[PDB]
C-alpha cells in the first residue's frame, strides 16, 4: 500500500473540502475521478500541522489512478506538510518539500508537477517525463515584457517586482546563478509560499511578473483573461514521477508512462485538464 505525496497545483491537483458526510462532490466533465487526500488545514509558516480529509482531483490524480490500476497497487494520498516542491538547504544538508518527505519514508512516491533536475536526480529516481514543458512569465494583461532577458528583469530594482515560488527548483536556480545575481537575490525579497498566492498577487498588481511552469501559467491565462504569458518557453524540461532509488516499482512506472504517451492517454489527460 503506497503512500503518495502531492501538492496543490491546478490543473494537475485540485484540492477542495469534503462534503459534510466526508465524501467528495460528484462532478462531471464522464465522472470526474476524485480521491480523499489528507492535508494540513493550517497553511501558515512555523505552524502545527493538523491534518484533515480533503478531496483531490486533476491531471496528476487521473495519472495516479492509471498507474495504480496498471501496476496493481493500493495507495493513500496526502498533501506535502510544508506546502513545498523541494529544495536542498544547508542546516549538514537537508531536503524540504515533497523531496524531503520521499527521502524520509513519509512518502513512497511523489505524483505531482515535479521538475526533473540534476540536483534532485542525485538523490531520487525520476520516471521518464509524463509532461514536457518549461518556464514562462505570467503578467497582467497590460504589462509589456519581452521575456527573461528584458532589462527590467536583467538589471532590476524595486520599480518592477517579480518572483517565483519559494523552495521550488526555479527559486534556488535564481539565488544560485552568477549572471542572475541582481535578479537571483531580488526574487529572494519577493518570493511566494505557493503558486496560487503568486498568481492572485499578479491580478491584484502586487506582483508584476511571476516566473513559473508553463504548463500551470498557460492554463491560468487560458482561464483568467486579465492574465497573459509573455516570452518564449525557456529551460525546457519535464515533470516526472518521483521514487526512492531502491523502489521496486521504478521500471514499471516508466514503462507505464511511456505506454500512456504512445497510446494517447497522456493526450487525453491534456484534453481533459489542460486544453
Amino acid at each position: 500500500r503506497l503512500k503518495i505525496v502531492t501538492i496543490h497545483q491546478e490543473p494537475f491537483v485540485y484540492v477542495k473540502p469534503t462534503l459534510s458526510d466526508g465524501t467528495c462532490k460528484e462532478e462531471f466533465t464522464d465522472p470526474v475521478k476524485k480521491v480523499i487526500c489528507t492535508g494540513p488545514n493550517d497553511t501558515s509558516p512555523g505552524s502545527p500541522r493538523h491534518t484533515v480529509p480533503q478531496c483531490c482531483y486533476g491531471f496528476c490524480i487521473d495519472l495516479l489512478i492509471k498507474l495504480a490500476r496498471t501496476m496493481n497497487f493500493t495507495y493513500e494520498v496526502h498533501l506535502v506538510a510544508d506546502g513545498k516542491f523541494g529544495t536542498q538547504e544547508r542546516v549538514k544538508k537537508e531536503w524540504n518539500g515533497m523531496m524531503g518527505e520521499l527521502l524520509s519514508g513519509q512518502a513512497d512516491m511523489i505524483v505531482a508537477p515535479l521538475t526533473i533536475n540534476n540536483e534532485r536526480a542525485q538523490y531520487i529516481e525520476f520516471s521518464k517525463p509524463f509532461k514536457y514543458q518549461g518556464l514562462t512569465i505570467l503578467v497582467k494583461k497590460g504589462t509589456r515584457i519581452t521575456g527573461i532577458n528584458d532589462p527590467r528583469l536583467r538589471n532590476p530594482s524595486d520599480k518592477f517586482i517579480y518572483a517565483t515560488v519559494k523552495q521550488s527548483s526555479v527559486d534556488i536556480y535564481f539565488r544560485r546563478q552568477v549572471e542572475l545575481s541582481t535578479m537571483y537575490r531580488h526574487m529572494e525579497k519577493h518570493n511566494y509560499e505557493s503558486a496560487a498566492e503568486a498568481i492572485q498577487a499578479v491580478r491584484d498588481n502586487k506582483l508584476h511578473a511571476f516566473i513559473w511552469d508553463s504548463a500551470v501559467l498557460e492554463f491560468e491565462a487560458s482561464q483568467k483573461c486579465d492574465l497573459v504569458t509573455t516570452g518564449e518557453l525557456f529551460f525546457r524540461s519535464g515533470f516526472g514521477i518521483g521514487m526512492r532509488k531502491d523502489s521496486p516499482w521504478k521500471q514499471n512506472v516508466s514503462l507505464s508512462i511511456l505506454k500512456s504517451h504512445e497510446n494517447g492517454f497522456m493526450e487525453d489527460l491534456d484534453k481533459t485538464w489542460v486544453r
Binding site: 533536475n117 540534476n118 521518464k128 536556480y173 525546457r236 511511456l258 505506454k259 504512445e262 497522456m266
Partner: protein, 281 residues
C-alpha cells in the same frame, strides 16, 4: 576509470549525426569531428568486409564528446550496418537497439527515440532532445494532426490523402499499434528516407509526411522558401525524447543521466541547440 574504453554505436541522421569522408592523405579527422568506423562489405557473396575510417559530427556527437569528458570514458565509435534505429524482427532486435541488446555496443548515441518496447530490452538515459510524431505538409494544407479523420479513415475522402512515413522506426511502430487502418493504407506511400519524402512533398506526389518531430522541425527550419511546415502549435503526438540506449543494468547510466541533466541546467544544452538546430524559417 576501469574498463572505460567503450564500444559505441551511432547512425547517420542530420543534424544529429553527420558522416563525412576522412582526408585520405592524413587519415585524421579534423576540427569538430570524431573518428567513426563503418564496416563495408567486399561483395554480396561474402561476409568479408573492411572497416572504413570516417568522421562524425553533429548535435549527438557533441553530446558524446561532453559525456566522454564528464563521465571519463574513451570510445570506439561505429556506424550500425544491420538495419537502422531499431526494429524487432521475428523477435530479434536489429539496428542500434540490436547492437546494445546483443552486447556489441555499450551504448547507442544518435537520433534514437525512447519508447516502451525498446525500454523493455535496453535502459535509456533521460531524454536529451524532445521529440515525438509530427506531420509535415506544404503550407496551407489543413490537417489537425495524426488524429485527423483524413488519416484515420482516408478512403472516406475523394480523392484520398496521400501520406506516408519512413518504415521500420518508432513512428511506424506507433502507427501500426494505434491506427491499423491508417497503417495498412499508408504502406503504399512508404518512403525510403527523409530526403525522398521531402522531394515527394515539394513536387506534389505526397500530401503529408509523418515522422519524428525533431527531424521534421529541423527540416522545416532549413526549407527553401519556407514552404514545408509542421502542423499545429509546433504539435507533437506521443511526446518522448531521444535517449542514450545502454545495456540493461548498465553501470554507466547513473553518471550519464546526471551529466545530461547538468548540461540542461548549465545552459550547455541550449548552446548545442543554437549551434545545430536553429533554422531561418
Amino acid at each position: 576509470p576501469d574498463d572505460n574504453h567503450l564500444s559505441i554505436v551511432t547512425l547517420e541522421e542530420a543534424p544529429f549525426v553527420i558522416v563525412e569522408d576522412i582526408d585520405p592523405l592524413t587519415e585524421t579527422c579534423v576540427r569538430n569531428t570524431v573518428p567513426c568506423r563503418k564496416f563495408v562489405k567486399i561483395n554480396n557473396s561474402t561476409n568479408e568486409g573492411m572497416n572504413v575510417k570516417k568522421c562524425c559530427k553533429g548535435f549527438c556527437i557533441d553530446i558524446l564528446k561532453k559525456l566522454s569528458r564528464t563521465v571519463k570514458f574513451t570510445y570506439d565509435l561505429y556506424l550500425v550496418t544491420n538495419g537502422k534505429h531499431g526494429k524487432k524482427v521475428n523477435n530479434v532486435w536489429n539496428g542500434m537497439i540490436g547492437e546494445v541488446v546483443y552486447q556489441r555496443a555499450v551504448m547507442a548515441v544518435g537520433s534514437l527515440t525512447i519508447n516502451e518496447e525498446r525500454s523493455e530490452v535496453v535502459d535509456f538515459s533521460v531524454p536529451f532532445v524532445e521529440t515525438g510524431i509530427s506531420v509535415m505538409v506544404s503550407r496551407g494544407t489543413q490537417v489537425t494532426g495524426l488524429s485527423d479523420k483524413k488519416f484515420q479513415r482516408p478512403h472516406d475522402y475523394s480523392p484520398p490523402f496521400r501520406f506516408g512515413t519512413v518504415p521500420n522506426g518508432s513512428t511506424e511502430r506507433n502507427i501500426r499499434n494505434n491506427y491499423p487502418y491508417m497503417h495498412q493504407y499508408m504502406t503504399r506511400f512508404n518512403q525510403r528516407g527523409v530526403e525522398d519524402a521531402l522531394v515527394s512533398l515539394k513536387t506534389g506526389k505526397l500530401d503529408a509526411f509523418i515522422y519524428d518531430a525533431a527531424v521534421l522541425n529541423y527540416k522545416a527550419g532549413r526549407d527553401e522558401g519556407c514552404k514545408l511546415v509542421t502542423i499545429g502549435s509546433g504539435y507533437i503526438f506521443a511526446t518522448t525524447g531521444y535517449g542514450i540506449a545502454l545495456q540493461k543494468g548498465s553501470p554507466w547510466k547513473r553518471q550519464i543521466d546526471l551529466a545530461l541533466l547538468q548540461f540542461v541546467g548549465d545552459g550547455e544544452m541550449e548552446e548545442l541547440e543554437t549551434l545545430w538546430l536553429t533554422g531561418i524559417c
